[PDB]
Amino acid sequence: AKSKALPWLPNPSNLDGRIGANGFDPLGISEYFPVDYLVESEIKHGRVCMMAWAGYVAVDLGARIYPLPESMQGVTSATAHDPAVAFGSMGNMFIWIALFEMVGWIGLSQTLQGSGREPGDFGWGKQFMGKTQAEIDTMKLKELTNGRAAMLAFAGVVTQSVLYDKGFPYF
Amino acid sequence: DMTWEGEYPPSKVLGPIMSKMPSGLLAIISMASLGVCVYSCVQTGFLLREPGAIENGSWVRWYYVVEGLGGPLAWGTHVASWIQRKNGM
Amino acid sequence: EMSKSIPFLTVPEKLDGSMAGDVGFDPMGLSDIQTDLNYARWAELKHGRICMLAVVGMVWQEYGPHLPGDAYATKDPWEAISSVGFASNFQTLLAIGVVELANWNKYYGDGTPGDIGWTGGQLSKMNDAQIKTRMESEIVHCRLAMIAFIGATHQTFLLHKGLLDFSY
Ligand code: CLA
Ligand code: CLA
Ligand code: CLA
Ligand SMILES: CC(=O)O[C@H]1CC(C)(C)C(=C=C/C(C)=C/C=C/C(C)=C/C=C/C=C(C)/C=C/C=C(\C)C(=O)C[C@@]23O[C@]2(C)C[C@@H](O)CC3(C)C)[C@](C)(O)C1
Ligand SMILES: CC(=O)O[C@H]1CC(C)(C)C(=C=C/C(C)=C/C=C/C(C)=C/C=C/C=C(C)/C=C\C=C(/C)C(=O)C[C@@]23O[C@]2(C)C[C@@H](O)CC3(C)C)[C@](C)(O)C1
Ligand SMILES: CC(=O)O[C@H]1CC(C)(C)C(=C=C/C(C)=C/C=C/C(C)=C/C=C/C=C(C)/C=C\C=C(/C)C(=O)C[C@@]23O[C@]2(C)C[C@@H](O)CC3(C)C)[C@](C)(O)C1
Ligand SMILES: CC1=C(/C=C/C(C)=C/C=C/C(C)=C/C=C/C=C(C)/C=C/C=C(C)/C=C/C2=C(C)CCCC2(C)C)C(C)(C)CCC1
């Protein structure tokens, strides 16, 4: 059975029946690493990047909140981490991020040990996910599809911005 | 369970992940890891042997430190490749 | 199966909703090794009750009428200890000790956790359900006080500013 994405290569089997399975796993990481771990990672990376990209672009198009610490004046999205970490913004958000991440680690452990928590599920805002499994699945693919794009998007923004010192267009 | 007999151990002893990896892949990884470790050592050696400029322990670099850990991994990976080969996978 | 408080984790068995304040919260699973949660409940209540008084006292001492006499005027809560003196402190300690040793059996016994008889006339002439409601109120307030105590103390030694001083 050949993969849809790479017709000349065999299909990755362990990834079958998963959201966003286009048959693309040329190096076969799935055959070796636990799938639930991989799935959780893809989702987390995507969600983080989605927000990261938005933040980068937003600040670059102005957006600074009010009142703004003086040290934060005249800072691009890039070259803002250090001013912020000095002020205390980064540290004050790191604390909460850490808390959630630690509890999440417990969830991941239980998921891998077999508890029933689907990878990436934190039971948040499921009300808007629809009722029919079909619509639920479409929503999930929507998140994943946007997420994959976001990962690539963020990379471009940060790399192009630093390399050529440019603003929003071609950030 | 892990008790084994013969001339080669079963793949179960290589863990829950490497037990499914092909022998060749492990070999490639092993060689690469050893290379990184050796490179790190040689490069760091120059830093330690360069006149002055290493005061306050400036010779210690985060990348080289991490790279140096490839050496032990190289051993493990090369041993694992052999086990996988004998096991047929 | 799944905790109500944390929707993505499995609830420990001992947390079954019987006790007040059981929102199914035990992520680290500290309830399994324990034979029962009685001693732990006693401690939760004791710690919380002390914290309640502490937070109130700290605020009062900083912004409130002090007792007549010098050595009883320092607003700084931490400095107060030394200022007031060993005699005053010792007498309080001894009193607390008496109560603690008198109710020793209660703490290590099998009675209603947290009940030492100081119920006033309250918690009387009321159905079991009403009683539970009161008990839940106490545990909620206890937990709030404990969190507040940490914040108040930390703010004092980190920001070095009065509790009610809100300046940015
Ligand atoms: C397009 C992006 C997108 C989409 C389609 C989804 C979709 C989904 N997420 Mg999700 N998520 C996203 C982004 C997204 N997410 C991001 C960026 C984060 C990190 C902040 C998360 C964090 C998150 C958690 C923690 C959980 C989910 C869950 C879910 C699923 C439950 C259905 C649901 O919550 O409502 C989906 C319905 C919608 C998203 C419709 C909303 C339409 C958009 C959002 C308009 C909103 C306006 C604007 C975007 C708000 C500003 C945000 C930004 C500027 C900061 C569903 C599949 C839950 C789950 O069980 O997953 C299996 C769950 O536990 N998500
Ligand atoms: C955790 C409890 C706690 C502790 C350890 C302290 C400790 C202290 N307080 Mg303080 N205080 C507290 C709660 C506490 N307070 C509360 C809740 C209030 C508000 C009513 C006050 C109001 C207050 C004032 C107005 C003053 C102090 C002062 C002082 C210091 C001298 C002792 C004194 O005169 O107390 C005075 C104690 C009271 C006025 C009443 C205490 C209320 C107790 C806790 C009621 C509980 C009794 C208990 C249930 C039954 C007995 C227990 C057992 C021993 C039998 C000392 C450092 C004095 C000072 O500034 O020193 C420099 C001072 O002038 N406190
Ligand atoms: C009951 C607990 C409690 C309460 C009421 C407060 C209250 C306060 N703290 Mg504090 N703190 C606490 C616990 C608490 N802290 C703990 C446990 C610690 C760590 C030991 C600290 C460490 C700390 C530091 C280091 C600082 C404060 C500061 C402050 C003040 C400004 C806080 C601020 O800007 O938040 C702003 C809040 C946000 C930016 C995020 C928005 C809030 C989220 C999104 C939702 C909030 C809703 C939630 C239900 C809160 C309701 C509970 C409350 C109303 C009772 C404020 C009086 C600061 C200050 O200057 O005070 C003098 C300050 O510098 N606190
Ligand atoms: C309690 C509760 O329920 O709350 C609810 C609230 C709410 C909102 C309903 C919920 C939600 C969902 C959320 C938060 C959804 C938000 C999702 C989000 C934020 C999705 C962004 C994607 C960004 C992308 C795709 C970027 C593309 C960017 C691309 C493709 C680029 O090419 C950018 C580009 O730069 C490059 C790289 C190169 C440049 O030269 C050129 C340009 C500029 C073009 C939840 C989860 O249900 C919870
Ligand atoms: C078919 C295919 O595809 O490939 C084929 C063809 C090909 C390529 C010919 C083949 C091969 C591959 C082979 C033979 C591969 C590998 C053989 C190998 C790799 C054999 C030993 C490594 C031993 C080490 C590293 C020992 C110690 C490492 C030690 C002792 C360290 O202490 C590291 C150290 O780190 C500490 C802890 C502290 C650090 O700070 C610094 C130092 C450095 C001191 C195969 C097998 O036929 C498969
Ligand atoms: C010479 C003369 O006549 O002028 C006088 C005039 C004037 C103005 C009066 C003066 C004064 C001041 C005086 C005399 C001040 C006396 C102050 C005094 C005596 C102050 C505190 C006792 C503290 C207690 C009890 C604190 C906590 C007790 C607590 C916190 C408990 O939690 C008990 C506890 O039970 C709970 C509730 C629950 C139980 O499960 C657990 C335990 C057992 C732990 C002068 C100036 O000095 C001299
Ligand atoms: C009973 C008895 C006794 C005792 C005995 C004993 C106690 C023994 C022990 C023994 C032992 C206990 C031994 C050991 C040995 C060890 C060894 C032999 C080791 C080796 C090692 C190695 C080989 C290494 C390797 C490596 C490297 C090199 C690097 C990489 C990684 C690794 C680490 C792997 C006596 C005599 C007193 C008396 C009589 C009786």
Report in angstroms the alpha-carbon separations of C95 from A103, C45, C50, C101, C102.
Answer: 42, 19, 15, 10, 11
Atom of ligand 1 nearest to the CA of A51: 17
Alpha helices in chain A (DSSP H): 29-32, 35-60, 81-87, 89-113, 133-164
This entry's atomic model was obtained through cryo-EM
Residue in C89, C98, C130, C94 with CA at minimum distance from that of residue C116: C98
Give the integer Cα–Cα distance in Å for C17 and A29: 44
Looking up tokens 């003196």 gives: C85
Closest residue by CA, ligand 2 atom 26: C66
How many alpha carbons fall within 13 Å on the CB side of residue A55? 11
- Nearest ligand by distance to the CA of C150: 3
Interface mutation vs chain B, best among A14, A25, A29, A32, most B CBs within 10 Å = A32
Please enumerate in sequence order all residues whose Cβ is within 8 A of that of B5, keeping only pairs 6 or more positions apart, or say none. Answer: none
> Which 3 state secondary structure label does DSSP give B10?
coil
Return the number of other C-beta atoms located less than 10 Å from residue C159's C-beta: 11
**How close does chain C come to A39, measured CA to CA in Å?**
16
Query: Which DSSP category does A97 fall into?
Result: H
Give the integer Cα–Cα distance in Å for C32 and C44: 17
C5 and A123 Cβ atoms separated by less than 8 Å: no
Q: C-chain residues within 8 Å CB-CB of A122?
A: 7-8
Report in angstroms the alpha-carbon separations of C159 from B41, C51, C156.
Answer: 47, 21, 6
CA C159 from chain center: how many Å?
Answer: 24
Prior bond of A12 cis (ω within 30°): no
Q: Is C54 in the pocket of ligand 6 (CB under 6 A)?
A: no
Give the integer Cα–Cα distance in Å for A5 and C122: 72
How many alpha carbons fall within 13 Å on the CB side of residue C107? 10
Q: What is the 3-state secondary structure (H, E, C) of chain C?
A: CECCCCCCCECCCCCCCCCCCCCCCCCCCCCCCCCCCHHHHHHHHHHHHHHHHHHHHHHHHHCCCCCCCCCCCCCCHHHHHHHHCHHHHHHHHHHHHHHHHHCHHHHCCCCCCCCCCCCCCCCCCCCHHHHHHHHHHHHHHHHHHHHHHHHHHHHHHHCCCCCCCCCC
Query: Which DSSP category does A127 fall into?
Result: G
The CA radius of gyration of chain B, in Å to the nearest whole number, is 18
Give the integer Cα–Cα distance in Å for B76 and B33: 10
Give the integer Cα–Cα distance in Å for A159 and A171: 8
Q: Is B77 in the pocket of ligand 5 (CB under 6 A)?
A: no
Please enumerate in sequence order all residues whose Cβ is within 8 A of that of A103, keeping only pairs 6 or more positions apart, or say none. Answer: C6, C9, C27
Give residue A2 CA to ligand 4 midpoint distance, Å.
33
C61 and C162 Cβ atoms separated by less than 8 Å: no
Q: Does A110 touch chain C (CB under 8 A)?
A: yes
Q: Nominal resolution in Å?
A: 2.8
